[PDB]
Amino acid sequence: GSSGSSGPPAVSDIRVTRSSPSSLSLAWAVPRAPSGAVLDYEVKYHEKGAEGPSSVRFLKTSENRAELRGLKRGASYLVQVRARSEAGYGPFGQEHHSQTQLDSGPSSG
């Protein structure tokens, strides 16, 4: 184990509901912090083929859910949700990939 943690545990079980072509709502499961409790969260989403600090966007939310807007439907997007605690900014949870599918009537079988 690492002596002296920086923040909360890397957000996990990140489910995405209410999908959309020009928007993507994200929601994680209130993770257990090694101290006190979580405060806010950050969502970093940047196309899967760009460079530069500006290219990537940032979203500050005080909840465990966010609603992204204006996005390139279909184009893969690497989103990362991190939690912030009294200690400090925690490590970005395990990479998260959306579906942003384009189908209408999916066959289950």
Which CATH number fits the domain that encloses residue 56?
A: 2.60.40.10
- 23-27: strand order across its sheet: 15-20, 23-27, 65-69
Domain span at residue 57 reads 13-101
Q: Alpha helix (H) ranges present in 1-109?
A: none
Q: Which residue has the tokens 């209130």?
A: 30
Query: Of all residues in the chain, what percent are helix, strand and coil, respectively (each to 5)?
Result: 0, 35, 65
Instruction: Give the pair of three-digit tokens for residue 19.
Output: 């999908």
State how many domains the chain has: 1
**Nearest-CA neighbor of 12 among 78, 105, 96, 71?**
96
